[PDB]
């Protein structure tokens, strides 16, 4: 039985516990291709269900995702409660290694849900995002304001009636009045945040760290309330890097959305490509062969080494040593030589396809892979012994912005931070995707404290394990097809397209109108370069995505930022920013 089959998920013990707790007429179970039990629950019992899941013997301790969905345009809703809007809550229990997805149905006029922030503190930014893009109000939320759009924005962009393109609206006319109005909108108002901008002894200092700061890894701004050098409170202001990629997912075909998936986490590349194409293959019912899995593992581990090299060099640069970034980018250029050879592009390859990859491996890729595998470990050991074993770097890093497993779980922290708290939870081992079971590699974990130094050394060990994976896949690569034999493989193989009429017809209708994926819900969760990246795709049975929800780890890390750096100095914040491994396309999407 294939793993993409629509599973009703009535064999999960969490469903039985929910039946024995709330009764058999309290919820509906939706059969999806997510691999996760989807439970439609009533709005009145949402907090009780959340408390019951939090108080389980092996509880669901993490809020993975929280977002809305416009169901007004969804034609195929058989077996679902009647809804104009819906809110889904994706929760993870690491102890059971299980997920659940609670869905709440809302009418068009009664668009209010009880807040989830008391059960999970990381729900704050998710609820602000759901209010900003869908207009759904959360009762009891502390500060429900726009988080992706500026405060002087009319309408909610992820609603179906909102226009997706900039050409629908008037072209961007920057006048003096508009500049003044948007500058007053962008000015930080501490009375809105309850910052209390003064003390009897002295005055607090309000500083904009970002958008134009060397320490900020993008266009975002942390507003710091300071006394002298110490941070009293922080307001991380995001939404400056919003590209509307989910609304773009509603606007492109299944095949033509792959380059947009590539730019979600621009240091990730094929790592960003994999969850989307895996979810689309779950929707289509495509089981890719072994060679496709090994090639995709190759490219994603190569890009993981690339991203980790950039992260380590960036951390060393923000600590103060400006030398190893040059050599780390030289190693990045070696990886880029291999990636240019394979995919034809440097940093956004867009090489993964539905059912396979764009081309076969060119003749001679193993020579460049062997060159990189010989070049890498001496350079990495040099970086370690030159900067990562530096006592000044250790003084700037060890003990700085430290949190335990409780803070990592309550804020949805994934990736190197969660493993640095001692929780051994990696997606490539817990829920193995793309044939990662065939590769012998270790998962580094920490001692229980998630320092800057601990996260950086964990990423160094992850780089070494990725080098081991690359060596294993270089020594054993299958000799088969680079595309699946499914009819929904988009696009079909090129030579058959160029000389057969069936293949020409399939190519013609798949690159123009798009592949028709039948109406189902799919979900794929992978271990990204910066944490856990997930794609949740709702298909309406058409050639375009009805809903594309992208869960990213940098969003959770930036929401965790005020709770881990409050009371510290600004230097600790600089090291914390350099040691988080975030980019801002990842956050704002």
Restricting to residues 310-329, name those near another protein by CB under 8 A: 310, 325-327, 329
174 binds, among another protein, ligand SF4, ligand DCQ, none (CB under 5 to 8 A by kind): another protein
Determine which residue in the list 23, 194, 214, 364 makes contact with ligand DCQ, applying CB under 6 A: 214
Instruction: Taking the CA atoms of 474, 477, 481 and 483 in sequence, report the sign of the dihedral they define.
Output: negative
Q: How far apart are CA 257 and CA 248, in angstroms?
A: 8
User: Is 207 a residue that touches another protein (CB under 8 A)?
Assistant: no
| Residue among 363 and 378 whose Cβ is closer to another protein | 363
Q: How many CA atoms lie within 13 A of 441 on its CB side?
A: 27
Query: Residue 563: how many CB atoms within 10 A of its CB?
Result: 14
Residue 513 contact, options another protein, ligand DCQ, ligand SF4, none, Cβ 5-8 Å cut-off depending on partner type: another protein
HSE-up of 318 (CA within 13 Å, CB side)? 26
Angle, to 10 degrees, between the axis of helix 570-578 and the axis of helix 290-319? 160
263 binds ligand SF4 (CB under 6 A): yes
Q: Which residues inside 119-158 make contact with another protein, applying CB under 8 A?
A: 148-150, 157
Per-residue H/E/C for 452-518: HHHHHHHHHHHHHHHHHHHHHHHHCCCCCCCECCCCCCECCCHHHHHHCHHHHHHHHHHHCCCCCCC
Piece of the chain touching another protein by CB under 8 A; list 92-100, 375-383, 403-411, 496-504:
496-504
Cβ-closest position to ligand SF4 = 263
CB atoms within 10 A of CB 322: 11
Give the other-Cβ count within 10 Å of 136's Cβ.
Answer: 23
CA distance 292 to 68: 34
List 52, 162, 188, 441, residue binding another protein (CB under 8 A): 162
Q: How far is CA 48 from CA 90, 344, 455, in A?
A: 16, 52, 36
Judged by CB under 6 A, the residue of 325, 380, 409, 561 near ligand DCQ is 325
Segment interacting with ligand DCQ (CB under 6 A) among 155-163, 209-217, 365-373, 436-444: 209-217
Nearer Cβ to another protein (190/493): 493
> Applying CB under 8 A, which of residues 263, 291, 304, 464 lies at the interface with another protein?
263
Residues 126-165 contacting ligand SF4, CB under 6 A? none
DSSP helix/strand/coil, 565: helix
Please tell me the distance from the alpha carbon of residue 313 to that of residue 412, in angstroms, as a whole number.
Answer: 26
| Residue for token pair 């179906």 | 160
The site string for another protein over 338-377 (x = CB under 8 A, - otherwise) reads ---x--x-xxx----------xx-xxxx-xx---------
Least distance from C-beta 70 to another protein, angstroms?
9
Please list every residue from 96 through 125 that binds ligand SF4, using CB under 6 A.
none
At its nearest, how many Å lie between ligand DCQ and the CB of residue 385?
21
Min dist. Cβ of residue 266 to ligand SF4 (A) = 6
Q: How far is the CB of 12 from ligand DCQ (least distance, A)?
A: 41
- Restricting to residues 299-318, which ones interact with ligand DCQ according to CB under 6 A? 314, 317
Per partner kind, with CB cut-offs from 5 to 8 A, the member of another protein, ligand DCQ, ligand SF4, none near residue 230 is none
User: How many angstroms separate the CA atoms of 157 and 385, rounded?
Assistant: 50
217 binds ligand DCQ, rule: CB under 6 A? yes
Binds ligand DCQ by CB under 6 A, chosen from 29, 31, 207, 216: 216
Question: With binding defined as CB under 6 A, does residue 321 bind ligand DCQ?
Answer: no
Closest to ligand DCQ by CB, 354 or 574? 574
Q: Does 505 bind ligand SF4 (CB under 6 A)?
A: yes
* Stated length of the chain: 589
Measured in whole angstroms, the distance separating CA 346 from the mean position of its chain's CA atoms is 21
- Asked if the peptide bond before residue 512 counts as cis, ω within 30 degrees of 0, the response is no
Q: How far apart are CA 524 and CA 90, in angstroms?
A: 12
- Strand bridging mode 85-93 / 98-106: antiparallel
Residues that bind ligand DCQ (CB under 6 A): 214, 216-218, 314, 317, 325
């Amino acid at each position: 039985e294939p793993a993409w089959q629509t599973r009703d998920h009535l064999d999960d013990p969490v469903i039985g516990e929910l039946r024995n707790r709330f009764g058999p007429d309290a919820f509906t179970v939706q059969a999806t291709r997510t691999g996760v039990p989807v439970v439609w629950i009533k709005r009145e019992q949402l907090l009780e269900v959340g408390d019951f899941l939090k108080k389980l013997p092996k509880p669901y301790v993490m809020l993975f995702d929280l977002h809305g969905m416009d169901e007004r345009l969804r034609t195929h809703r058989e077996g679902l409660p009647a809804a104009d809007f819906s809110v889904f809550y994706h929760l993870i229990s690491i102890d059971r290694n299980r997920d659940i997805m609670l869905k709440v149905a809302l009418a068009e006029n009664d668009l209010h849900v009880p807040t989830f922030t008391k059960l999970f503190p990381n729900a704050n930014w998710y609820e602000r995002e759901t209010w900003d893009l869908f207009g759904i109000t959360f009762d009891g939320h502390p500060n429900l304001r726009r988080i992706m759009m500026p405060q002087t924005w009319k309408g909610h962009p992820l609603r179906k009636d909102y226009p997706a393109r900039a050409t629908e609206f008037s072209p961007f006319e920057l006048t003096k009045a508009k500049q003044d109005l948007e500058m007053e909108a962008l000015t930080f108002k501490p009375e809105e945040w309850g910052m209390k901008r003064g003390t009897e002894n002295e005055d607090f200092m309000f500083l904009n760290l970002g958008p134009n700061h060397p320490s900020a890894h993008g266009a975002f701004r942390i507003v710091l309330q300071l006394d002298g050098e110490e941070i009293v409170d922080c307001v991380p202001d995001i939404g400056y890097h919003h590209r509307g990629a989910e609304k773009m997912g509603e606007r492109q075909s299944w095949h033509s959305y792959i380059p947009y998936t590539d730019r979600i986490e621009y240091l990730g590349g094929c790592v960003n490509e994999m969850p989307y194409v895996l979810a689309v293959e779950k929707l289509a019912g495509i089981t890719v062969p072994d060679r496709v899995n090994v090639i995709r593992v190759m490219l994603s581990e190569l890009f993981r080494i690339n991203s980790h090299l950039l992260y380590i060099s960036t951390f060393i640069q923000d600590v103060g040593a400006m030398t190893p970034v040059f050599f780390a980018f030289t190693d990045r250029q070696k990886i880029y030589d291999l990636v240019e050879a394979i995919t034809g592009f440097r940093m956004h390859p867009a090489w993964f396809r539905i059912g396979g990859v764009a081309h076969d491996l060119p003749r001679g890729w193993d020579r460049l892979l062997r060159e990189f595998l010989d070049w890498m470990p001496k350079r990495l050991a040099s970086y370690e012994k030159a900067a990562l074993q530096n006592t000044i770097l250790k003084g700037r890093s060890q003990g700085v912005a430290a949190y335990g497993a409780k803070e990592a779980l309550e804020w949805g922290t994934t990736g190197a931070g969660l493993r640095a708290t001692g929780i051994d939870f990696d997606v490539r081992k817990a829920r193995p995707y793309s044939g990662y079971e065939n590769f012998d590699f270790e998962i580094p974990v920490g001692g229980g404290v998630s320092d800057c130094y601990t996260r950086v050394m964990l990423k160094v060990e992850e780089l070494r394990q990725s080098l081991r994976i690359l060596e294993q896949c270089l020594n054993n690569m299958p000799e088969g097809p680079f595309k699946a034999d499914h009819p929904l493989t988009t696009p079909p193989p090129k030579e058959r397209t160029l000389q057969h009429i069936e293949t020409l017809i399939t190519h013609f209708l798949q690159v123009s109108w798009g592949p028709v994926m039948p109406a189902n819900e799919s979900f794929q969760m992978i271990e990204a370069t910066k944490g856990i990246n997930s794609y949740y795709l709702t298909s309406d049975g058409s050639t375009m995505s009805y809903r594309t929800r992208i869960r990213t780890p940098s969003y959770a890390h930036l929401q965790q930022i005020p709770a881990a750096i409050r009371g510290s100095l600004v230097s600790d914040l600089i090291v914390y920013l350099g040691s988080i491994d975030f980019v801002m396309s990842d956050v704002d999407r």
